[PDB]
Amino acid sequence: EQYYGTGRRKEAVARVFLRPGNGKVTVNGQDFNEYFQGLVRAVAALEPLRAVDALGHFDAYITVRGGGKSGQIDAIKLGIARALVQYNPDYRAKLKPLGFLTRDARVVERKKYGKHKARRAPQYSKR
Amino acid sequence: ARKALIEKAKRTPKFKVRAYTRCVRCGRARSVYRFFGLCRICLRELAHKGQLPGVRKASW
Amino acid sequence: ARRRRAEVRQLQPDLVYGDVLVTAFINKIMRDGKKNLAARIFYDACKIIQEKTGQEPLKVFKQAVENVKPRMEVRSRRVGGANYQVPMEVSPRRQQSLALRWLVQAANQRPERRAAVRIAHELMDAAEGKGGAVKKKEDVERMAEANRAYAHYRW
Amino acid sequence: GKGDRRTRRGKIWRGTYGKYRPRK
Amino acid sequence: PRSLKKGVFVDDHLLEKVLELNAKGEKRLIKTWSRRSTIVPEMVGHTIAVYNGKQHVPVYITENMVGHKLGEFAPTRTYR
Amino acid sequence: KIRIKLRGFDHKTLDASAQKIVEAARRSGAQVSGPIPLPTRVRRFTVIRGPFKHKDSREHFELRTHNRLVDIINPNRKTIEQLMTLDLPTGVEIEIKT
Amino acid sequence: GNKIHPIGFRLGITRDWESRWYAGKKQYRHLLLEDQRIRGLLEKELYSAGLARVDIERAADNVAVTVHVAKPGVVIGRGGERIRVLREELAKLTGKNVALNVQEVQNPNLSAPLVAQRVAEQIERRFAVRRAIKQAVQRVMESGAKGAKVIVSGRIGGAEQARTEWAAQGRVPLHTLRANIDYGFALARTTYGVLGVKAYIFLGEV
Amino acid sequence: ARIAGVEIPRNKRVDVALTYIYGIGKARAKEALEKTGINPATRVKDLTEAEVVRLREYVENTWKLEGELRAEVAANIKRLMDIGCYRGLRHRRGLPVRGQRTRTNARTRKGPRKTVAG
RNA sequence: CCGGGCACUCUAACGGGACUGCCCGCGAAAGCGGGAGGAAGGAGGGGACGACGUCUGGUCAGCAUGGCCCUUACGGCCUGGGCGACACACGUGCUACAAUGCCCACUACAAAGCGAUGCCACCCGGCAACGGGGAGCUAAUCGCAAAAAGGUGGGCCCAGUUCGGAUUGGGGUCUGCAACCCGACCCCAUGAAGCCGGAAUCGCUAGUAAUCGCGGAUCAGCCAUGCCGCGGUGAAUACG
């Protein structure tokens, strides 16, 4: 029928729905290659399905929002991972050794006073 | 600061531009927060006392 | 690194080749945090280097980076007055880092107008055994075999 | 770049509007 | 690049004084503590003493200097 | 449409007053949508610690105005029988717009 | 140069505001001014009556001024007389039609501002400050109060050079905010100078 | 390609090559290319004698230009200089006019640095 | 958008969750190395918090205050002027010297805040600053609003230039009683130095540096390139 994976990366949310089909993935009313046109890391979004031999066995519809498009791509990756796990749990044996089920918790660090941007200290000259 | 220099309180400044904040408690000459009507030193001490509701220790 | 060993960062693999050295080189090309523009530079250079010479850019890249890696260098050691240049070997990790840095710096010191063209021709020359990066490498190696009289100061 | 006030980037850096950066 | 954009502002102080001075013939030195006001055409011919903040300096007003202000000719600064 | 805008400087006070209102209205009325939370207005104030510099010492405080919504559906009498004036909380603030 | 105000630290957890109401952009300023006027008046008159805390609450033009006293007999007065004058003088400044409320505080030696006032009083009449200090810490320690601490400011006993006084007991951990640490400050104005009196009192755990 | 009082740009885009005229920047170049009905992206060499003559018609007499403009600006300086204006004094002493600070970084108007002792 | 629904993202209140608990190893112990499970581990990341005291550190020019001097006067009002001065010298920064770049159209993705005459959608006029009209939002519903780098398309062609915007001439808007001293902004024109910087010296060990924009407090206006926050992309390296 259909299986769901959410995923999250750097202030981005990518709801991923997976079904059987030919391998056509659409995003927010655009094909996957028109919305991420000319981005060299876009192929990493459909990377989690290369340990399961999808893209000809599967089909997807994704709705993504928030942050920048790179976080969107990686949240798509994670959401595809969880949808794939809920489809077939045995896929975990080929997923976590690849590392596609781990939530990347690297967040931008808040800015601190006395600094320029949160670590950079202002330059002194003749101490 | 100086008593007479709180003449802004009777405003009648002869011109609408001459209105400045003049923190109520300390009579601050330079740096006054308009929302509290206080200055950074008076705001600091009053928020330390606990007389400004809702004011907590910011941390994140 | 006073306390710990400063564990090496494990870079992400590459989306085109699946190789980590490609991602490291793309990072070395990146400036101001633009990995997208740097990747486009490297891959347009890949197309150019695969067309202007009918070889695979994979093994040419690998052979060039292998040709630029030096085997000895010099470090300054304070002994009996002013310090001296003491030769020694190189770590494999440091060989990798120095090779990629010399690659990028010799590529951008080239006359070619576009960045990708500079990258491609630099990789070609380095894969053939010539070029600017290999010249800097062989100067580093010429520092060795020259002040080798200090071979008893290895430390 | 950002200091050229009759270009678009100099307009967005100063935040103003004009002939070289119309509002909409 | 100087702008007043409508109803070019001239203070009442010297305005009424000079428009009543013109009616009886040209007058000699005048007193001016208001350099905020603009010069108007009918001021030409008089001798206006303006305030430096310390001193009273006389200025000969002519046709050429109509568009400018009183105080362009009274230098506040003193150097060399 | 009976909108009840709840606002305060204290979150537990808002929860107390809102839950009391909803518990009062639940014995008379409908499937009431109940206590929806709204985003909080955060006012930050950075103050240089010491008078007469040491510029780079400043600390900041934050006030936060919390907001809640009730949206009772089809109340007639018994809801407002337990509504007129029965509440304890003081720091809470209630508005009613229709 | 360290050790920020403890009650300002404590305001969030295990401590409450001296004024708890709500306002907006157009109201907060002069309402806070009115609170300051109330506390000013009550510090003018009620200093010698043994008052510790003034808690002011507002729902909607309703004022609930709450005075915590160590001796309610001076606040109420004989036949209630004194709860008439300054309760009317309170409304002769603010036209909000405000009423007054009194409350009892047990063990005046257990409230840190009251202990500060006490030590400052004994300092103004020029007692040996260290005896007042240790005696106050004992008054605190003789009834619960798992910690007590007293600090006095410079020019002690009238000395020309400024100094710093001491003699806490028990355990007074100002660093950790867990266990309801109370604090009070007093000002002793004397001929030689001004003496600050800081009274820290630690009681309870959670 | 002679257009105004002596002015010969060459081998570039026309709108760009018009900036080389004194009283013409990018705005007036775009306006000339607009109202003269000429392709801006054309090279200077490919300009028709009729296109060049129409550009001359417009640019030559619509705005004051090189010699007249230089003399007009310099005579404006002399005009506010001969009057006792403060702005004229700032032009006399060779100091900035727009109301900047002269304690530091008055280099453009005051010339190269002449370092006295201290 | 509607009917409608809470499952989802979300908003915000309470909780669960990590404890070297499991296993191998080493060890007398704490603990250390490795592994699985887990969103996450050996302090998961960031704050708030700064001991007895030190330097007679800093300000009575915030406040409060102990003493010594002032009283037609240091007090006090107002106008003008000043704190903006320049033959120089440093500190902190901003913008740059370009092709991984500039400009031009076209288009997509943030978080945190602010707004009752205050923010100002929208129509008109004006090249524009801005003006006139005027809707809505007591603001998860309205508005500031467009994010910018990025994407595709185009022009530029290694040149003091379609780099760089200082300086200066003119025209004009706006706040304001009033912009000479001494404001910001718009338009035309002028288009300077500068082609990676001597000795020396500074910041940063992970979303960090670097770069990109956004907001805020103070404020009629603003010389803010400052300061305090926000997110976008995202390194290099640590033998010792």
Ligand SMILES: [Mg+2]
């Ligand atoms: Mg963050």
Ligand SMILES: [Mg+2]
């Ligand atoms: Mg950042």
Ligand SMILES: [Mg+2]
């Ligand atoms: Mg410093």
Ligand SMILES: [Mg+2]
């Ligand atoms: Mg005083």
Ligand SMILES: [Mg+2]
């Ligand atoms: Mg003002």
Ligand SMILES: [Mg+2]
């Ligand atoms: Mg002010």
Ligand SMILES: [Mg+2]
């Ligand atoms: Mg330009």
Ligand SMILES: [Mg+2]
């Ligand atoms: Mg500062």
Ligand SMILES: [Mg+2]
């Ligand atoms: Mg007290």
Ligand SMILES: [Mg+2]
């Ligand atoms: Mg004593």
Ligand SMILES: [Mg+2]
């Ligand atoms: Mg505590």
Ligand SMILES: [Mg+2]
């Ligand atoms: Mg509906």
Ligand SMILES: [Mg+2]
């Ligand atoms: Mg449910």
Ligand SMILES: [Mg+2]
């Ligand atoms: Mg382990």
Ligand SMILES: [Mg+2]
């Ligand atoms: Mg492990």
Ligand SMILES: [Mg+2]
């Ligand atoms: Mg593990």
